């Protein structure tokens, strides 16, 4: 689950892994993934 991965892994594919992460650990990941899609990556 690297950074460049959060992107390659469509949200749907991401929400797939999150399955098991508390509601707080889910928000921490729902952020960067949104940043990469915008950054140079």
From Swiss-Prot:
Acetylated in erythroid cells by CREB-binding protein (CBP). Acetylation augments the DNA-binding activity of NFE2, but has no effect on binding NFE2. Keywords: Acetylation, DNA-binding, Isopeptide bond, Nucleus, Phosphoprotein, Repressor, Transcription, Transcription regulation, Ubl conjugation. Signal peptide: none annotated. Disruption phenotype: Mice, although viable and fertile, exhibit abnormal megakaryocyte proliferation as well as age-dependent behavioral defects. Megakaryocytes display both anti-glycoprotein IIb immunoreactivity and anti-acetylcholinesterase activity. GO terms for biological process: adult behavior; in utero embryonic development; positive regulation of gene expression; positive regulation of transcription by RNA polymerase II; regulation of cell population proliferation; regulation of epidermal cell differentiation. Homodimer or heterodimer. Homodimerization leads to transcriptional repression. Forms high affinity heterodimers with members of the CNC-bZIP family such as NFE2, NFE2L1/NRF1, NFE2L2/NRF2 and NFE2L3/NRF3. Interacts with CREBBP; the interaction leads to acetylation of the basic region of MAFG and stimulation of NFE2 transcriptional activity through increased DNA binding. This is Transcription factor MafG. It comes from Mus musculus. The chain holds residues 24 to 64 of 162 of the full protein.
């Amino acid at each position: 689950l690297t950074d460049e991965e959060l992107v390659t892994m469509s949200v749907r594919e991401l929400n797939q892994h999150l399955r098991g992460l508390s509601k707080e650990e889910i928000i921490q990941l729902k952020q960067r993934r949104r940043t990469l899609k915008n950054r140079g990556y």
